[PDB]
Amino acid sequence: HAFKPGDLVFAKMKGYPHWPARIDDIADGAVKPPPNKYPIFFFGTHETAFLGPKDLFPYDKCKDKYGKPNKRKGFNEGLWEIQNNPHASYS
Numbered sequence: 001h002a003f004k005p006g007d008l009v010f011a012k013m014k015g016y017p018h019w020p021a022r023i024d025d026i027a028d029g030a031v032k033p034p035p036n037k038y039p040i041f042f043f044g045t046h047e048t049a050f051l052g053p054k055d056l057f058p059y060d061k062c063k064d065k066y067g068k069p070n071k072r073k074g075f076n077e078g079l080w081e082i083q084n085n086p087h088a089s090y091s
Helices: 059-066 075-084
Strands: 008-011 019-023 038-042 048-051 056-058
Touching: 008 038, 008 059, 019 075, 056 059
Parallel strands: none
Antiparallel strands: 008 019, 008 056, 019 038, 038 048
16 A cells, blocks of 8 residues: 555654654645655654655554654654654644
């Protein structure tokens, strides 16, 4: 299935563990992603970046592997958000 806004994922960025995140809507940002990349909202840190599917892991499938608490700044806060209110603004 293609990724849609509101999908919950773990998203992999260089130098960071697989991070709790959500697919945001492309209309929410002025700059559009390249083809086959998506706007990714990272929980805890609340940053947004463009990532492609090779770096996106569906949350329900991979939470047992990637949802372990750690000491990285904002990570455990992000785990709380994806579990308790993934669709909140946080703005």
